């Protein structure tokens, strides 16, 4: 998935140093989704439809991916090791630059 949906992993990063990677006390990022996929299964959502929902969800993520901290030339935030918000626009069906 990390390869198909194009994600690098820088740690603290680039040009001048600092932080994170805001960690979450005692709730695990892995499990809770499987609790909810079974919830969707009970409502009625078929397998492709569960992926297409999880797809538009991840599409909102890549719009940001504002990690680890804020930018100089603008104003804005971008995403590290490039790949960036092109990745949003592949997952839609519209052009990246706009």
């Amino acid at each position: 998935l990390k390869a198909d949906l194009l994600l690098s992993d820088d740690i603290y990063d680039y040009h001048f140093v600092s932080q994170g990677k805001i960690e979450i006390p005692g709730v695990d990022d892995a499990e809770e989704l499987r609790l909810t996929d079974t919830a969707f299964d009970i409502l009625g959502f078929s397998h492709e439809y569960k992926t297409d929902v999880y797809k538009i969800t991840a599409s909102c993520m890549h719009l940001g991916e504002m990690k680890f901290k804020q930018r100089p030339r603008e104003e804005q935030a971008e995403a590290d090791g490039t790949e960036e918000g092109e990745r949003v626009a592949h997952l839609l069906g519209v052009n990246a630059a706009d």
Binding site: S8, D10, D13, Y14, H15, F16, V17, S18, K69, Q70, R71, P72, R73, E74, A77, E78, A79, D80, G81, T82, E83
Partner: protein, 196 residues
């Protein structure tokens, strides 16, 4: 793609203030990717060519006392040992910003980009001098007692420990504070002791 350019410019990046807040608190810093070279570019600069003919002999003249990798390098570890004998204290809060202008593979080409960064720094001349230089209407010097007023008043009300140490240290050339030199002493021309 760009990942690679910024692998290169991860070692060479490193250069300039995200962990600015070492001793003083973590401020909203500058940051990240290949685009944002152009308002990392601020005022304070000057750029020279590669060949020196014999302009910068001084690196071959001085090198002797100072070395690390005599092929022609300094690496991430050196600053932690020679600078001890060249100037200021290094703490763990400020490590990477004390090393800030230099934590990349400084070959001669990137020695040029320590030199150009002596002329950039942390807001050199253009800012550092002119900051008080633009106070008065003519050949001024900064009006000391009004400077004491603003330090206790203006926005972030300071504390006494600063002021008194500042007062014994004040280079008052006759009835007002000579800020232009209390700043421009770190260059002009005409001495030879510390710094390096």
């Amino acid at each position: 793609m760009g990942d690679e350019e910024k692998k290169e410019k991860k070692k060479k990046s490193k250069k300039k203030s995200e962990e600015e807040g070492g001793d003083a608190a973590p401020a909203p810093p500058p940051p990240k990717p290949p685009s944002q070279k152009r308002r990392a570019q601020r005022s304070g600069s000057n750029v020279f060519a590669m060949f020196t003919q014999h302009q910068v002999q001084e690196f071959k003249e001085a090198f002797q006392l100072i070395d690390q990798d005599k092929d022609g390098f300094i690496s991430k570890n050196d600053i932690r040992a020679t600078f001890d004998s060249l100037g200021r204290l290094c703490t763990e809060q400020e490590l990477d910003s004390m090393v800030a202008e230099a934590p990349g593979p400084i070959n001669f080409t990137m020695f040029l980009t320590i030199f150009g960064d002596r002329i950039a720094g942390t807001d050199e001349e253009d800012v550092i001098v002119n900051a008080f230089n633009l106070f008065d209407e003519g050949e001024g010097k900064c009006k000391e007692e009004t400077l004491k007023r603003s330090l206790t008043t203006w926005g972030e009300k300071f504390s006494q420990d600063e002021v008194e140490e500042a007062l014994s240290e004040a280079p008052i050339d006759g009835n007002g504070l000579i800020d232009i030199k209390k700043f421009a002493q770190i260059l002009t021309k005409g001495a030879e002791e510390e710094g390096a």
